[PDB]
Design a binder for this molecule. Sequence first.
Ligand SMILES: O=C(O)C1=C[C@@H](OP(=O)(O)O)[C@@H](O)[C@H](O)C1
Ligand SMILES: O=C(O)C[NH2+]CP(=O)(O)O
Length: 445
Amino acid sequence: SSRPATARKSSGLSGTVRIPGDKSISHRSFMFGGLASGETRITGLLEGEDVINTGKAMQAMGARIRKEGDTWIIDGVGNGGLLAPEAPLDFGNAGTGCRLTMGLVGVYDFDSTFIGDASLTKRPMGRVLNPLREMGVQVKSEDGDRLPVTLRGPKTPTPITYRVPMASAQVKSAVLLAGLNTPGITTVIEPIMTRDHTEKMLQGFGANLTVETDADGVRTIRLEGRGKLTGQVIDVPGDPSSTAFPLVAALLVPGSDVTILNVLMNPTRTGLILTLQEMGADIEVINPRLAGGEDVADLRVRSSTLKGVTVPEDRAPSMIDEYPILAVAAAFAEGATVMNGLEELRVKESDRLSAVANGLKLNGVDCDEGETSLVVRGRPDGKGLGNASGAAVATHLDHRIAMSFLVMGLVSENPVTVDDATMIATSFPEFMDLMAGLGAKIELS
Ligand SMILES: O=C(O)C1=C[C@@H](OP(=O)(O)O)[C@@H](O)[C@H](O)C1
Ligand SMILES: O=C(O)C[NH2+]CP(=O)(O)O
């Protein structure tokens, strides 16, 4: 059921590796390719479990998906062409696929049921189900608006103007996707910018979607519904969230020099790099270029001495999935690192604020967990950190809790053990091999 793993202090990590594909863009490649008219060809797709589940949900609604050589080829159904699924759409651990698909298919005049694993089933769906109710979708959900959920769209959906209450790219995305099958103009107002893969990719697929940004930063995103979408050639860039693991490991493990190739550098995804640089990290951005319509670069990372910094609440959306690994980096930095505006961490695969704080404490780190913040004081030499008794960090079915603590064990005086490595494959099945190839000592027990 669970498969624990232990990370041990390592000698300098060294090498050059291509990081797996971006999870957010990969989910959307399967969704948009499956919906569009004609053929979509995708290279660099992330083949982690989350993405595969989204692909299976699209196949259940009529898309034909296959892998030829290293390219995934999709024959889409055309906008408005999704077919009623025979059985529930099983998203496993994937909130991105689940929430975006609820918007995509909830507005269709047939029933669709959504289910998932023990982790996804505890997470909030109200943030997307509320706007969908406004568009005319009938919702049946478990108390607290949790899965399983069954949606039934109206014959004619109602377009809406929706101001997203929290900094969620998924809510913005679900409303836009619902708008694709809704007559009229659907508008999403985003007060604080979140990753913009939906907007960029839908424009690439031919959607009449515009983004207007006020000087104060508020984004008004307009989409004309029931328009044609045309299949595209997609080149998926490397995942900057997956990149964070070998990158932080190379900063922390003495004697390290690691280069990660083809990393997505869209600024809505690089808050951690900015933060680590402020902490004194040696991260070189090499050959910045345009690939697949996105900014990418190679990153050369060398061992660095880090100092604690203040990470403001407004930077959170650009690095929300990187707080676990940032907290591990802070555990080896000089002084205190303070991070606020972390409420969203409590509703991820695990309540990440709680899981990170507990994991850090179990491994001897001085930290203070607030309702929406975390303060970490580091021990640069790693002495006294880790857990000599071999006690395991509770991962709570969260791939990043498992990976962040395995990175910690490559630096701490005592080994770090995580209770389960099974969920790492949801976003980074290549993790163990990749890290081992760089010299990391991690053993699956
Ligand atoms: O839209 C996306 O691709 C994602 C948005 C984020 O979730 P929220 O919208 O809930 O912030 C992020 O944590 C997730 O891994 C991917
Ligand atoms: O990948 C991450 O760090 C968080 N994913 C959240 P989900 O995609 O499950 O909603």
